[model samples]
Target: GQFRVIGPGHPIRALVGDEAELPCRISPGKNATGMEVGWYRSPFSRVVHLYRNGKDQDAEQAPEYRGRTELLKESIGEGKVALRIQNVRFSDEGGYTCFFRDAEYQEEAAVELKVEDPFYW
Candidate 1:
């Protein structure tokens, strides 16, 4: 259990109006069911999604992502998780920081999303 956050090696390409699921995993893979897992953009100004206290915190999410973002924790017990962005927009194309915190200790990783417009759209 190295206890570190890890992200995909390359940037993910997603189409506009589609969905993008950002990959985020914990190194060595240990149980993370009790940790605070969340995703936020740089500067920590706009939070995408936050999962803590055994549930998702809607109030802490950014208004633009309130109902469009979801924290995928189906495998959190094994320190594997992800953030899913529904209805991708041009504004969603950027870098995102995913973090997991265990009380006083916290670690994060970056995941880039490249959103493009559909030729038919």
Candidate 2:
């Protein structure tokens, strides 16, 4: 079987203090029963969110995101790790990673977050 990679093109850009979402997906017919879904900082830095068996674990959230970020819980069952940043800030801009893992397979995805602020919405 092959892994159907899913993600977004050019990170979703938003203004500081605004909201942004990083979208990801997997092949609809794939099996993910025993796999772990995670969102991480790029270049293999750190994990931000982890999903397994439909539950979330946030033990690795960075200091700045202790209370401001969340994984779209509703989408995890469908193999998505799109992160929702409630209050976007200059510090939130960077590269990110999304990955899936099981005892037998490992799949990885990447996305970039470009945050900007303007006088108008």
Candidate 3:
């Protein structure tokens, strides 16, 4: 069977300087404990965050996002893998790719992040 990584159907909105969570998951309920999970931007040209072999791998993380992104490992048990970005900035509003790969399966899902600010009257 083919494995699929799913993301939110609609764009996720967040306020500037606030935190945002980008949700993704493996379909058919599979354990991804041993797989390589990665969050990227611009079609894999840049790494937002990455996890592999049950730990975070930051050697390749983007400089601008190095200390601002985190993986929510607690939800991995339910096949729910999420990326958290803190202090969201205007530059962070864009499309992201959630990728998962292993010896036998590989899949990716696209997620959008929209950053906004509260309007004052």
Candidate 4:
């Protein structure tokens, strides 16, 4: 199968101390059962969130984001997986990578997050 991952077309802006969501989903609307879904900071240095084997896996999650990130599960069946980050911080502004992997294929997409002052919102 042709594997593809999709993210927001443009950069997303969020206010400091506010919540933010980075949207990602698999193309062709295929179910992602048994697949690994991951959200990573640029340079692959840290894992923000990971979903595998039907549940969230945090053994490898970054300490900074251990309890701050979650996967939106409502749309997983339709290939619409999204990452929600609570209490946005200045350090969170940067590039992110959304990835998906199965036994024979893998795909990824880039997402940019811009964190601004709450007053600007």
Error of 3 at 113 (Å): 0.7
lDDT of 3 by residue, 17-92 (tens): 8899999999876788888999998755699999998888988788888889899988787678889999998888
Ten contiguous residues minimizing lDDT sum, candidate 3: 112-121
Q: Which pairs of residues collide in candidate 3?
A: none
Estimate, for each residue in 1-121, the C-alpha lDDT of model 4 and write its tens digit: 6868999899989899999999998988888866899999977658999999998997878888888999998888888888999999998999999998987689999999998996865
Q: Write the per-residue lDDT of candidate 2 for residues 6-108, one digit (tens) a residue.
A: 6777667878888888877776635454577777876657776776765666665666666767777555556655678788888778888887776567777
TM-score, candidate 1, is 0.93
TM-score of each: 0.93, 0.79, 0.92, 0.93
- Model 3: residues with Cα > 4 Å off, grouped in runs: 119-121
Better of 3 and 4 by lDDT: 4
The lDDT of each candidate is: 0.88, 0.72, 0.87, 0.89
User: What is the Cα root-mean-square deviation between model 3 and the actual structure?
Assistant: 1.6
lDDT value, residue 2 of candidate 2? 60
Candidate 1's displacement at residue 5, Å, is 0.6
Candidate 2 wrong stretches, greater than 4 Å: 28-34
Q: Judge candidate 3 against the unseen true structure and give its global Cα lDDT, from 0 to 1.
A: 0.87
RMSD of each: 1.8, 2.5, 1.6, 1.4
